[PDB]
Ligand binder design. Structure first.
Ligand code: A1H3H
Ligand code: OLA
Ligand code: OLA
Ligand code: OLA
Ligand code: OLA
Ligand code: OLA
Ligand code: OLA
Ligand code: OLA
Ligand code: OLA
Ligand code: OLA
Ligand code: OLA
Ligand code: OLA
Ligand code: OLA
Ligand code: NA
Length: 390
Protein backbone atom coordinates (compact mmCIF):
# COMPACT_ATOMS: atom_id res chain seq x y z
CA UNK A 1 0.00 0.00 0.00
CA UNK A 2 1.64 3.17 -1.27
CA UNK A 3 1.43 6.29 0.92
CA UNK A 4 -1.88 8.04 0.19
CA UNK A 5 -0.20 11.47 0.08
CA UNK A 6 1.47 10.51 -3.22
CA UNK A 7 -1.83 9.25 -4.65
CA UNK A 8 -3.37 12.65 -3.81
CA UNK A 9 -0.80 15.27 -4.84
CA UNK A 10 -1.78 14.69 -8.47
CA UNK A 11 -5.45 15.06 -7.49
CA UNK A 12 -4.92 18.37 -5.68
CA UNK A 13 -2.73 19.59 -8.54
CA UNK A 14 -5.36 18.74 -11.17
CA UNK A 15 -8.09 20.32 -9.04
CA UNK A 16 -6.02 23.48 -8.56
CA UNK A 17 -5.02 23.59 -12.24
CA UNK A 18 -8.66 23.41 -13.32
CA UNK A 19 -9.62 26.07 -10.77
CA UNK A 20 -7.16 28.59 -12.21
CA UNK A 21 -8.46 28.02 -15.75
CA UNK A 22 -12.05 28.31 -14.51
CA UNK A 23 -11.48 31.70 -12.87
CA UNK A 24 -9.56 33.34 -15.72
CA UNK A 25 -11.70 32.24 -18.66
CA UNK A 26 -15.09 33.04 -17.14
CA UNK A 27 -14.04 36.43 -15.73
CA UNK A 28 -12.93 37.30 -19.27
CA UNK A 29 -16.51 36.69 -20.43
CA UNK A 30 -17.94 38.94 -17.71
CA UNK A 31 -15.39 41.57 -18.72
CA UNK A 32 -16.42 41.50 -22.39
CA UNK A 33 -20.14 41.80 -21.64
CA UNK A 34 -19.54 44.86 -19.46
CA UNK A 35 -17.29 46.48 -22.09
CA UNK A 36 -19.07 45.93 -25.41
CA UNK A 37 -22.70 47.05 -25.48
CA UNK A 38 -23.39 44.85 -28.52
CA UNK A 39 -22.92 41.91 -26.14
CA UNK A 40 -25.53 43.40 -23.77
CA UNK A 41 -28.79 41.58 -24.48
CA UNK A 42 -31.19 39.14 -22.83
CA UNK A 43 -29.23 36.18 -24.22
CA UNK A 44 -25.90 37.21 -22.69
CA UNK A 45 -27.39 38.22 -19.33
CA UNK A 46 -27.97 34.49 -18.84
CA UNK A 47 -24.39 33.82 -19.96
CA UNK A 48 -23.06 36.01 -17.14
CA UNK A 49 -25.39 34.18 -14.74
CA UNK A 50 -23.69 30.99 -15.97
CA UNK A 51 -20.13 32.36 -15.96
CA UNK A 52 -20.73 33.55 -12.39
CA UNK A 53 -21.64 29.96 -11.49
CA UNK A 54 -18.45 28.70 -13.14
CA UNK A 55 -16.30 31.27 -11.31
CA UNK A 56 -17.65 30.21 -7.91
CA UNK A 57 -16.84 26.59 -8.80
CA UNK A 58 -13.12 27.33 -9.02
CA UNK A 59 -13.26 29.77 -6.10
CA UNK A 60 -15.26 27.80 -3.53
CA UNK A 61 -16.52 24.47 -4.89
CA UNK A 62 -13.09 23.10 -5.84
CA UNK A 63 -11.50 24.15 -2.51
CA UNK A 64 -14.45 22.36 -0.89
CA UNK A 65 -13.72 19.19 -2.88
CA UNK A 66 -10.08 19.14 -1.74
CA UNK A 67 -11.25 19.63 1.86
CA UNK A 68 -13.71 16.72 1.99
CA UNK A 69 -11.15 14.43 0.33
CA UNK A 70 -9.45 14.19 3.74
CA UNK A 71 -12.55 13.19 5.71
CA UNK A 72 -11.74 15.84 8.30
CA UNK A 73 -13.61 16.09 11.59
CA UNK A 74 -16.38 18.70 11.70
CA UNK A 75 -19.99 19.19 12.70
CA UNK A 76 -22.38 17.06 10.66
CA UNK A 77 -24.34 20.08 9.43
CA UNK A 78 -21.17 22.03 8.64
CA UNK A 79 -20.02 19.10 6.52
CA UNK A 80 -23.33 19.19 4.64
CA UNK A 81 -22.61 22.72 3.38
CA UNK A 82 -19.15 21.79 2.09
CA UNK A 83 -20.61 18.69 0.41
CA UNK A 84 -23.78 20.21 -1.09
CA UNK A 85 -22.65 23.70 -2.15
CA UNK A 86 -21.56 22.41 -5.57
CA UNK A 87 -25.17 21.24 -5.99
CA UNK A 88 -26.28 24.88 -5.73
CA UNK A 89 -23.88 26.00 -8.46
CA UNK A 90 -24.91 23.04 -10.63
CA UNK A 91 -28.61 23.85 -10.26
CA UNK A 92 -28.31 27.47 -11.40
CA UNK A 93 -26.20 26.36 -14.37
CA UNK A 94 -29.04 24.09 -15.50
CA UNK A 95 -31.47 26.97 -15.02
CA UNK A 96 -29.26 29.27 -17.10
CA UNK A 97 -29.05 26.65 -19.86
CA UNK A 98 -32.81 26.10 -19.90
CA UNK A 99 -33.33 29.88 -19.90
CA UNK A 100 -31.09 30.42 -22.94
CA UNK A 101 -32.88 27.68 -24.90
CA UNK A 102 -36.26 29.31 -24.23
CA UNK A 103 -34.92 32.74 -25.21
CA UNK A 104 -33.66 31.41 -28.55
CA UNK A 105 -36.98 29.64 -29.17
CA UNK A 106 -38.85 32.94 -28.78
CA UNK A 107 -36.47 34.70 -31.19
CA UNK A 108 -37.09 32.25 -34.05
CA UNK A 109 -40.74 31.42 -33.32
CA UNK A 110 -42.08 34.89 -32.45
CA UNK A 111 -39.54 37.49 -33.68
CA UNK A 112 -42.17 40.24 -33.94
CA UNK A 113 -43.05 40.04 -30.23
CA UNK A 114 -39.56 39.16 -28.96
CA UNK A 115 -38.77 42.74 -27.90
CA UNK A 116 -42.04 42.91 -25.95
CA UNK A 117 -41.60 39.65 -24.04
CA UNK A 118 -37.95 39.64 -22.95
CA UNK A 119 -36.59 42.78 -21.28
CA UNK A 120 -33.38 43.75 -19.53
CA UNK A 121 -35.28 44.12 -16.25
CA UNK A 122 -37.52 41.09 -16.78
CA UNK A 123 -34.51 38.81 -17.34
CA UNK A 124 -32.67 40.11 -14.26
CA UNK A 125 -35.54 39.08 -12.00
CA UNK A 126 -35.57 35.60 -13.53
CA UNK A 127 -31.89 35.20 -12.65
CA UNK A 128 -32.57 36.12 -9.01
CA UNK A 129 -35.48 33.67 -8.82
CA UNK A 130 -33.32 30.91 -10.32
CA UNK A 131 -30.48 31.53 -7.85
CA UNK A 132 -32.93 31.30 -4.94
CA UNK A 133 -34.35 28.02 -6.28
CA UNK A 134 -30.82 26.69 -6.83
CA UNK A 135 -30.00 27.24 -3.15
CA UNK A 136 -33.20 25.47 -2.11
CA UNK A 137 -32.62 22.45 -4.36
CA UNK A 138 -28.90 22.26 -3.62
CA UNK A 139 -29.24 22.60 0.16
CA UNK A 140 -32.16 20.20 0.61
CA UNK A 141 -30.10 17.71 2.72
CA UNK A 142 -29.41 20.43 5.30
CA UNK A 143 -33.16 20.69 6.00
CA UNK A 144 -33.15 17.18 7.49
CA UNK A 145 -32.74 14.84 4.48
CA UNK A 146 -29.30 13.67 5.57
CA UNK A 147 -27.51 10.96 7.57
CA UNK A 148 -26.67 13.05 10.64
CA UNK A 149 -29.11 10.95 12.68
CA UNK A 150 -27.11 7.76 12.02
CA UNK A 151 -23.43 8.73 12.24
CA UNK A 152 -20.69 6.15 11.74
CA UNK A 153 -19.16 6.05 15.22
CA UNK A 154 -16.37 3.71 14.11
CA UNK A 155 -14.85 6.23 11.70
CA UNK A 156 -15.39 9.23 14.00
CA UNK A 157 -13.13 7.78 16.69
CA UNK A 158 -10.70 6.74 13.94
CA UNK A 159 -10.03 10.29 12.76
CA UNK A 160 -9.82 11.39 16.40
CA UNK A 161 -13.05 13.35 16.05
CA UNK A 162 -14.28 15.08 19.18
CA UNK A 163 -17.68 14.71 20.79
CA UNK A 164 -20.46 15.62 18.36
CA UNK A 165 -18.10 15.62 15.36
CA UNK A 166 -18.07 13.20 12.42
CA UNK A 167 -15.77 12.35 9.52
CA UNK A 168 -16.85 14.66 6.70
CA UNK A 169 -17.44 12.19 3.86
CA UNK A 170 -19.94 12.75 1.06
CA UNK A 171 -21.36 9.23 0.92
CA UNK A 172 -21.76 9.27 4.72
CA UNK A 173 -23.68 12.56 5.04
CA UNK A 174 -25.66 12.84 1.76
CA UNK A 175 -28.18 10.01 1.22
CA UNK A 176 -28.11 8.18 -2.10
CA UNK A 177 -31.89 8.37 -2.59
CA UNK A 178 -31.53 12.16 -2.70
CA UNK A 179 -28.72 12.09 -5.27
CA UNK A 180 -30.47 9.66 -7.63
CA UNK A 181 -34.19 10.45 -7.43
CA UNK A 182 -34.45 14.06 -6.25
CA UNK A 183 -31.25 15.48 -7.75
CA UNK A 184 -30.55 13.38 -10.85
CA UNK A 185 -33.96 12.28 -12.13
CA UNK A 186 -36.12 15.23 -11.06
CA UNK A 187 -33.80 18.25 -10.89
CA UNK A 188 -31.19 17.28 -13.55
CA UNK A 189 -32.46 14.59 -15.94
CA UNK A 190 -35.91 16.13 -16.46
CA UNK A 191 -34.59 19.67 -17.23
CA UNK A 192 -32.09 18.26 -19.74
CA UNK A 193 -34.87 16.37 -21.54
CA UNK A 194 -36.83 19.61 -21.92
CA UNK A 195 -33.74 21.27 -23.39
CA UNK A 196 -33.56 18.46 -25.95
CA UNK A 197 -37.20 19.04 -26.88
CA UNK A 198 -36.97 22.82 -27.13
CA UNK A 199 -33.96 22.60 -29.45
CA UNK A 200 -35.82 20.17 -31.72
CA UNK A 201 -38.63 22.70 -32.19
CA UNK A 202 -36.12 25.48 -32.89
CA UNK A 203 -34.35 23.63 -35.70
CA UNK A 204 -37.64 22.29 -37.09
CA UNK A 205 -39.32 25.71 -37.12
CA UNK A 206 -36.26 27.18 -38.84
CA UNK A 207 -36.40 24.51 -41.55
CA UNK A 208 -40.11 25.20 -42.02
CA UNK A 209 -39.42 28.91 -42.50
CA UNK A 210 -36.80 28.14 -45.16
CA UNK A 211 -39.22 25.85 -47.00
CA UNK A 212 -41.84 28.61 -47.15
CA UNK A 213 -39.47 31.06 -48.84
CA UNK A 214 -38.53 28.50 -51.49
CA UNK A 215 -42.15 27.36 -51.89
CA UNK A 216 -43.45 30.94 -51.97
CA UNK A 217 -40.73 31.72 -54.51
CA UNK A 218 -41.62 28.66 -56.61
CA UNK A 219 -45.27 29.75 -56.60
CA UNK A 220 -44.15 33.25 -57.69
CA UNK A 221 -41.77 32.74 -60.62
CA UNK A 222 -43.12 29.46 -62.01
CA UNK A 223 -46.66 30.86 -62.07
CA UNK A 224 -45.58 33.92 -64.08
CA UNK A 225 -43.85 31.62 -66.58
CA UNK A 226 -47.22 29.91 -67.08
CA UNK A 227 -48.78 33.06 -68.55
CA UNK A 228 -45.96 33.40 -71.09
CA UNK A 229 -47.58 30.38 -72.80
CA UNK A 230 -51.23 31.13 -72.02
CA UNK A 231 -54.51 30.20 -73.67
CA UNK A 232 -57.57 32.02 -72.31
CA UNK A 233 -58.01 35.24 -70.36
CA UNK A 234 -59.04 33.21 -67.30
CA UNK A 235 -55.98 30.94 -67.54
CA UNK A 236 -53.77 33.88 -66.56
CA UNK A 237 -56.23 35.02 -63.88
CA UNK A 238 -55.34 31.80 -62.04
CA UNK A 239 -51.57 32.26 -62.37
CA UNK A 240 -51.58 35.95 -61.41
CA UNK A 241 -53.80 35.12 -58.42
CA UNK A 242 -51.36 32.37 -57.41
CA UNK A 243 -48.58 34.96 -57.45
CA UNK A 244 -50.74 37.36 -55.43
CA UNK A 245 -51.29 34.91 -52.56
CA UNK A 246 -47.55 34.13 -52.62
CA UNK A 247 -46.61 37.82 -52.67
CA UNK A 248 -48.40 38.47 -49.38
CA UNK A 249 -47.39 35.17 -47.77
CA UNK A 250 -43.73 36.01 -48.47
CA UNK A 251 -44.10 39.60 -47.21
CA UNK A 252 -44.88 38.28 -43.71
CA UNK A 253 -38.46 49.66 -45.90
CA UNK A 254 -36.16 48.41 -48.65
CA UNK A 255 -38.76 45.76 -49.52
CA UNK A 256 -41.71 48.02 -48.63
CA UNK A 257 -41.39 49.60 -52.07
CA UNK A 258 -40.37 46.24 -53.53
CA UNK A 259 -43.64 44.50 -52.72
CA UNK A 260 -45.86 47.56 -53.20
CA UNK A 261 -44.39 47.86 -56.69
CA UNK A 262 -44.70 44.18 -57.61
CA UNK A 263 -48.16 43.52 -56.14
CA UNK A 264 -49.42 46.68 -57.85
CA UNK A 265 -48.25 45.41 -61.23
CA UNK A 266 -50.02 42.11 -60.50
CA UNK A 267 -53.40 43.72 -59.80
CA UNK A 268 -52.92 45.77 -62.99
CA UNK A 269 -52.90 42.42 -64.84
CA UNK A 270 -55.94 40.66 -63.34
CA UNK A 271 -58.20 43.50 -64.49
CA UNK A 272 -56.41 43.67 -67.84
CA UNK A 273 -57.33 40.00 -68.29
CA UNK A 274 -60.70 40.45 -66.57
CA UNK A 275 -61.69 42.18 -69.84
CA UNK A 276 -60.40 39.48 -72.20
CA UNK A 277 -57.20 41.32 -73.18
CA UNK A 278 -54.74 38.42 -73.00
CA UNK A 279 -51.91 39.81 -75.14
CA UNK A 280 -52.02 43.25 -73.50
CA UNK A 281 -51.86 41.72 -70.02
CA UNK A 282 -48.81 39.56 -70.77
CA UNK A 283 -46.90 42.64 -71.94
CA UNK A 284 -47.50 44.31 -68.56
CA UNK A 285 -46.17 41.12 -66.93
CA UNK A 286 -42.61 41.46 -68.24
CA UNK A 287 -42.46 44.57 -66.04
CA UNK A 288 -42.82 42.14 -63.12
CA UNK A 289 -39.61 40.39 -64.21
CA UNK A 290 -37.46 43.45 -63.47
CA UNK A 291 -39.06 43.92 -60.04
CA UNK A 292 -38.83 40.18 -59.38
CA UNK A 293 -35.14 40.01 -60.33
CA UNK A 294 -33.92 43.32 -58.87
CA UNK A 295 -35.86 45.14 -56.16
CA UNK A 296 -37.45 42.20 -54.30
CA UNK A 297 -35.10 39.25 -54.79
CA UNK A 298 -32.54 40.88 -52.48
CA UNK A 299 -35.05 40.51 -49.63
CA UNK A 300 -35.45 36.74 -50.01
CA UNK A 301 -31.68 36.35 -49.62
CA UNK A 302 -31.34 38.86 -46.78
CA UNK A 303 -34.17 37.15 -44.89
CA UNK A 304 -32.48 33.84 -45.70
CA UNK A 305 -29.18 35.32 -44.50
CA UNK A 306 -30.68 36.33 -41.15
CA UNK A 307 -32.31 32.92 -40.64
CA UNK A 308 -28.98 31.14 -41.14
CA UNK A 309 -27.40 33.60 -38.69
CA UNK A 310 -30.07 32.96 -36.05
CA UNK A 311 -29.84 29.17 -36.40
CA UNK A 312 -26.05 29.34 -36.02
CA UNK A 313 -26.61 30.80 -32.54
CA UNK A 314 -29.04 27.97 -31.75
CA UNK A 315 -26.29 25.46 -32.54
CA UNK A 316 -23.74 27.39 -30.47
CA UNK A 317 -26.02 27.33 -27.42
CA UNK A 318 -26.97 23.68 -27.98
CA UNK A 319 -23.30 22.66 -28.13
CA UNK A 320 -22.83 24.22 -24.70
CA UNK A 321 -25.87 22.49 -23.21
CA UNK A 322 -24.72 19.20 -24.71
CA UNK A 323 -21.23 19.56 -23.23
CA UNK A 324 -22.81 20.13 -19.81
CA UNK A 325 -24.65 16.80 -19.85
CA UNK A 326 -21.53 14.98 -21.07
CA UNK A 327 -19.38 16.22 -18.16
CA UNK A 328 -22.01 15.40 -15.51
CA UNK A 329 -23.60 12.11 -16.61
CA UNK A 330 -20.62 9.85 -15.65
CA UNK A 331 -20.84 10.98 -12.02
CA UNK A 332 -24.61 10.52 -11.92
CA UNK A 333 -24.51 6.98 -13.31
CA UNK A 334 -21.84 5.99 -10.76
CA UNK A 335 -24.26 7.05 -8.01
CA UNK A 336 -27.04 5.15 -9.78
CA UNK A 337 -24.93 1.98 -9.62
CA UNK A 338 -23.96 2.35 -5.95
CA UNK A 339 -27.66 2.86 -5.19
CA UNK A 340 -29.31 0.37 -7.57
CA UNK A 341 -26.83 -2.55 -7.40
CA UNK A 342 -25.76 -3.02 -3.75
CA UNK A 343 -24.46 -6.53 -4.45
CA UNK A 344 -22.03 -4.83 -6.84
CA UNK A 345 -18.69 -3.63 -5.53
CA UNK A 346 -18.40 0.14 -5.17
CA UNK A 347 -16.57 1.94 -7.96
CA UNK A 348 -12.83 2.26 -7.23
CA UNK A 349 -11.41 5.49 -5.86
CA UNK A 350 -9.43 6.24 -9.02
CA UNK A 351 -12.66 6.22 -11.04
CA UNK A 352 -14.33 8.50 -8.48
CA UNK A 353 -11.49 10.98 -9.01
CA UNK A 354 -11.97 10.94 -12.79
CA UNK A 355 -15.73 11.52 -12.59
CA UNK A 356 -15.34 14.45 -10.19
CA UNK A 357 -12.49 16.05 -12.16
CA UNK A 358 -14.51 15.61 -15.36
CA UNK A 359 -17.52 17.30 -13.74
CA UNK A 360 -15.34 20.31 -12.85
CA UNK A 361 -14.02 20.58 -16.42
CA UNK A 362 -17.41 21.98 -17.49
CA UNK A 363 -16.39 25.28 -15.84
CA UNK A 364 -13.55 25.71 -18.38
CA UNK A 365 -14.99 24.74 -21.77
CA UNK A 366 -17.65 27.48 -21.88
CA UNK A 367 -15.31 30.47 -22.51
CA UNK A 368 -13.84 28.52 -25.45
CA UNK A 369 -17.22 27.96 -27.13
CA UNK A 370 -18.09 31.67 -27.06
CA UNK A 371 -14.92 32.56 -28.95
CA UNK A 372 -14.72 29.76 -31.53
CA UNK A 373 -18.41 30.24 -32.43
CA UNK A 374 -19.33 33.91 -31.77
CA UNK A 375 -17.38 36.50 -33.75
CA UNK A 376 -18.17 39.48 -31.53
CA UNK A 377 -17.00 37.66 -28.40
CA UNK A 378 -13.69 36.89 -30.13
CA UNK A 379 -12.90 40.48 -31.11
CA UNK A 380 -13.91 41.87 -27.71
CA UNK A 381 -11.64 39.27 -26.13
CA UNK A 382 -8.70 40.18 -28.38
CA UNK A 383 -9.07 43.85 -27.45
CA UNK A 384 -8.67 42.81 -23.81
CA UNK A 385 -5.38 41.02 -24.50
CA UNK A 386 -4.01 43.91 -26.56
CA UNK A 387 -5.11 46.53 -23.99
CA UNK A 388 -3.67 44.64 -21.00
CA UNK A 389 -0.61 42.69 -22.14
CA UNK A 390 0.94 46.10 -22.85
C1 A1H3H B 1 -22.27 16.06 -5.63
C2 A1H3H B 1 -20.94 15.74 -6.27
N1 A1H3H B 1 -20.10 14.89 -5.42
C3 A1H3H B 1 -20.32 13.51 -5.51
O1 A1H3H B 1 -21.19 13.06 -6.25
C4 A1H3H B 1 -19.44 12.77 -4.67
C5 A1H3H B 1 -18.43 13.35 -3.96
N2 A1H3H B 1 -17.67 12.43 -3.29
C6 A1H3H B 1 -18.23 11.26 -3.61
C7 A1H3H B 1 -17.72 9.96 -3.19
C8 A1H3H B 1 -16.67 9.82 -2.39
C9 A1H3H B 1 -15.31 10.31 -2.60
C10 A1H3H B 1 -14.95 11.01 -3.75
C11 A1H3H B 1 -13.69 11.54 -3.91
C12 A1H3H B 1 -12.75 11.39 -2.89
O2 A1H3H B 1 -11.50 11.93 -2.90
C13 A1H3H B 1 -11.30 13.11 -3.67
C14 A1H3H B 1 -13.08 10.68 -1.73
O3 A1H3H B 1 -12.16 10.51 -0.75
C15 A1H3H B 1 -14.35 10.15 -1.59
N3 A1H3H B 1 -19.31 11.41 -4.43
C16 A1H3H B 1 -20.19 10.35 -4.94
N4 A1H3H B 1 -18.23 14.72 -3.99
C17 A1H3H B 1 -16.86 15.24 -3.94
C18 A1H3H B 1 -16.35 15.39 -2.53
C19 A1H3H B 1 -19.20 15.52 -4.57
O4 A1H3H B 1 -19.26 16.71 -4.34
C1 OLA C 1 -11.48 14.09 -18.78
C2 OLA C 1 -10.35 14.78 -18.04
C3 OLA C 1 -9.35 13.76 -17.51
C4 OLA C 1 -8.22 14.42 -16.73
C5 OLA C 1 -7.00 13.51 -16.72
C6 OLA C 1 -6.85 12.83 -15.36
C7 OLA C 1 -6.09 13.74 -14.42
C8 OLA C 1 -5.93 13.34 -13.02
C9 OLA C 1 -7.15 13.11 -12.16
C10 OLA C 1 -6.71 12.58 -10.80
C11 OLA C 1 -6.50 11.07 -10.87
C12 OLA C 1 -6.37 10.47 -9.48
C13 OLA C 1 -5.04 9.75 -9.31
C14 OLA C 1 -4.86 9.28 -7.88
C15 OLA C 1 -5.86 8.19 -7.51
C16 OLA C 1 -5.13 7.04 -6.84
O1 OLA C 1 -4.42 6.27 -7.52
O2 OLA C 1 -5.23 6.86 -5.61
C1 OLA D 1 -2.12 25.23 -9.24
C2 OLA D 1 -1.78 23.87 -9.81
C3 OLA D 1 -0.35 23.52 -9.44
C4 OLA D 1 -0.26 23.13 -7.97
C5 OLA D 1 1.09 23.54 -7.37
C6 OLA D 1 1.10 23.31 -5.86
C7 OLA D 1 0.41 21.99 -5.52
C8 OLA D 1 0.71 21.55 -4.09
C9 OLA D 1 1.04 20.08 -4.10
O1 OLA D 1 0.65 19.34 -5.03
O2 OLA D 1 1.70 19.57 -3.17
C1 OLA E 1 -13.62 37.54 -7.93
C2 OLA E 1 -14.27 37.85 -9.27
C3 OLA E 1 -14.82 39.27 -9.29
C4 OLA E 1 -15.81 39.46 -10.44
C5 OLA E 1 -15.16 39.15 -11.78
C6 OLA E 1 -15.99 39.69 -12.94
C7 OLA E 1 -15.57 41.12 -13.28
C8 OLA E 1 -16.47 41.66 -14.37
C9 OLA E 1 -16.42 43.08 -14.73
C10 OLA E 1 -16.26 44.13 -13.65
C11 OLA E 1 -16.82 45.46 -14.15
C12 OLA E 1 -15.87 46.12 -15.14
C13 OLA E 1 -14.93 47.09 -14.43
C14 OLA E 1 -15.44 48.52 -14.53
C15 OLA E 1 -14.30 49.50 -14.81
C16 OLA E 1 -14.76 50.94 -14.65
C17 OLA E 1 -14.66 51.65 -15.98
O1 OLA E 1 -13.54 51.93 -16.47
O2 OLA E 1 -15.69 51.97 -16.61
C1 OLA F 1 -16.81 36.76 -6.18
C2 OLA F 1 -18.12 36.60 -6.95
C3 OLA F 1 -17.87 36.53 -8.45
C4 OLA F 1 -19.19 36.56 -9.22
C5 OLA F 1 -19.28 37.77 -10.14
C6 OLA F 1 -20.65 37.79 -10.78
C7 OLA F 1 -20.89 38.50 -12.04
C8 OLA F 1 -20.40 39.91 -12.25
C9 OLA F 1 -20.89 40.40 -13.61
C10 OLA F 1 -20.56 41.88 -13.83
C11 OLA F 1 -20.86 42.33 -15.25
C12 OLA F 1 -22.11 41.68 -15.82
C13 OLA F 1 -23.27 42.66 -15.86
C14 OLA F 1 -23.03 43.75 -16.90
C15 OLA F 1 -24.22 43.83 -17.83
O1 OLA F 1 -24.47 42.91 -18.63
O2 OLA F 1 -24.97 44.83 -17.80
C1 OLA G 1 -10.28 31.59 -2.54
C2 OLA G 1 -9.98 30.45 -1.57
C3 OLA G 1 -10.30 30.86 -0.14
C4 OLA G 1 -11.80 30.80 0.12
C5 OLA G 1 -12.16 29.75 1.16
C6 OLA G 1 -11.67 28.39 0.72
C7 OLA G 1 -11.99 27.21 1.53
C8 OLA G 1 -12.03 27.32 3.04
C9 OLA G 1 -12.36 25.97 3.66
C10 OLA G 1 -12.36 26.06 5.18
C11 OLA G 1 -12.57 24.70 5.83
C12 OLA G 1 -11.74 24.57 7.10
C13 OLA G 1 -11.78 23.15 7.66
C14 OLA G 1 -11.06 23.08 9.00
C15 OLA G 1 -12.08 23.00 10.12
O1 OLA G 1 -13.04 22.21 10.05
O2 OLA G 1 -11.97 23.74 11.12
C1 OLA H 1 -6.98 29.01 -6.81
C2 OLA H 1 -7.30 28.03 -5.68
C3 OLA H 1 -7.73 28.77 -4.42
C4 OLA H 1 -7.94 27.82 -3.24
C5 OLA H 1 -6.62 27.52 -2.53
C6 OLA H 1 -6.86 26.79 -1.21
C7 OLA H 1 -6.99 25.28 -1.42
C8 OLA H 1 -6.98 24.54 -0.09
C9 OLA H 1 -8.20 24.92 0.72
C10 OLA H 1 -8.39 24.36 2.07
C11 OLA H 1 -7.90 22.96 2.38
C12 OLA H 1 -8.70 22.36 3.53
C13 OLA H 1 -8.16 22.78 4.89
C14 OLA H 1 -7.93 21.57 5.78
C15 OLA H 1 -6.84 21.83 6.81
C16 OLA H 1 -5.67 20.87 6.65
C17 OLA H 1 -6.13 19.41 6.68
C18 OLA H 1 -5.16 18.60 7.52
O1 OLA H 1 -4.04 19.06 7.82
O2 OLA H 1 -5.47 17.46 7.92
C1 OLA I 1 -11.25 35.14 2.00
C2 OLA I 1 -11.04 34.27 3.23
C3 OLA I 1 -9.64 33.66 3.23
C4 OLA I 1 -9.66 32.23 3.74
C5 OLA I 1 -8.28 31.64 3.63
C6 OLA I 1 -8.07 30.20 3.84
C7 OLA I 1 -8.70 29.49 5.02
C8 OLA I 1 -8.29 28.03 5.01
C9 OLA I 1 -8.47 27.38 6.37
C10 OLA I 1 -7.63 26.12 6.49
C11 OLA I 1 -6.66 26.23 7.66
C12 OLA I 1 -7.13 25.43 8.87
C13 OLA I 1 -6.37 25.86 10.12
C14 OLA I 1 -5.30 24.85 10.44
O1 OLA I 1 -4.70 24.25 9.52
O2 OLA I 1 -4.99 24.61 11.62
C1 OLA J 1 -22.11 30.95 5.40
C2 OLA J 1 -22.97 29.81 5.76
C3 OLA J 1 -22.84 29.17 7.13
C4 OLA J 1 -23.32 27.72 7.06
C5 OLA J 1 -22.72 26.89 8.18
C6 OLA J 1 -23.75 26.58 9.26
C7 OLA J 1 -23.45 25.24 9.93
C8 OLA J 1 -22.90 25.44 11.34
C9 OLA J 1 -22.38 24.13 11.92
C10 OLA J 1 -23.10 23.82 13.21
O1 OLA J 1 -23.68 24.73 13.85
O2 OLA J 1 -23.12 22.65 13.66
C1 OLA K 1 -28.19 32.12 1.29
C2 OLA K 1 -29.69 32.13 1.01
C3 OLA K 1 -30.06 33.28 0.08
C4 OLA K 1 -29.57 33.02 -1.34
C5 OLA K 1 -29.38 34.34 -2.09
C6 OLA K 1 -29.15 34.11 -3.58
C7 OLA K 1 -28.30 35.24 -4.15
C8 OLA K 1 -28.95 35.88 -5.37
C9 OLA K 1 -28.21 37.15 -5.70
C10 OLA K 1 -28.62 38.00 -6.83
C11 OLA K 1 -28.99 37.37 -8.16
C12 OLA K 1 -28.46 38.26 -9.27
C13 OLA K 1 -29.35 39.47 -9.51
C14 OLA K 1 -28.84 40.28 -10.69
C15 OLA K 1 -29.72 40.08 -11.92
C1 OLA L 1 -26.65 13.74 -25.85
C2 OLA L 1 -25.68 14.84 -25.76
C3 OLA L 1 -25.18 15.52 -27.01
C4 OLA L 1 -23.80 16.11 -26.75
C5 OLA L 1 -23.06 16.34 -28.06
C6 OLA L 1 -23.26 17.76 -28.58
C7 OLA L 1 -21.97 18.34 -29.14
C8 OLA L 1 -20.76 17.95 -28.29
C9 OLA L 1 -19.46 18.50 -28.86
C10 OLA L 1 -19.64 18.89 -30.31
C1 OLA M 1 -29.80 14.26 -21.95
C2 OLA M 1 -28.97 14.29 -23.22
C3 OLA M 1 -29.11 15.63 -23.94
C4 OLA M 1 -28.55 16.76 -23.10
C5 OLA M 1 -29.01 18.12 -23.60
C6 OLA M 1 -28.58 18.36 -25.04
C7 OLA M 1 -28.68 19.84 -25.39
C8 OLA M 1 -29.19 20.03 -26.81
C9 OLA M 1 -28.18 19.48 -27.79
C10 OLA M 1 -28.55 19.30 -29.20
C11 OLA M 1 -29.86 18.64 -29.55
C1 OLA N 1 -6.12 20.60 -16.97
C2 OLA N 1 -7.18 21.41 -17.70
C3 OLA N 1 -7.89 20.58 -18.75
C4 OLA N 1 -8.73 21.45 -19.68
C5 OLA N 1 -9.79 20.62 -20.38
C6 OLA N 1 -10.01 21.07 -21.82
C7 OLA N 1 -10.44 22.51 -21.86
C8 OLA N 1 -10.83 23.12 -23.14
C9 OLA N 1 -10.16 22.66 -24.42
C10 OLA N 1 -10.45 23.66 -25.53
NA1 NA O 1 -20.73 24.66 -14.70
Amino acid sequence: GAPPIMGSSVYITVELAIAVLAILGNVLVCWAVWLNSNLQNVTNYFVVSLAAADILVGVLAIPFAITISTGFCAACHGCLFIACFVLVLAQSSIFSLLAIAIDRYIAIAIPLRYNGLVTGTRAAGIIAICWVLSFAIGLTPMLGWNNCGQPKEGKAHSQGCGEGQVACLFEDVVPMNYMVYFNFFACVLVPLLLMLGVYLRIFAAARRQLADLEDNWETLNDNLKVIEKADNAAQVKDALTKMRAAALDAQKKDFRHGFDILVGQIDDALKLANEGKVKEAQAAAEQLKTTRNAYIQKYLERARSTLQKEVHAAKSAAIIAGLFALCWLPLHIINCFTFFCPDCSHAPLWLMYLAIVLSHTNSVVNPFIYAYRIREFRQTFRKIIRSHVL
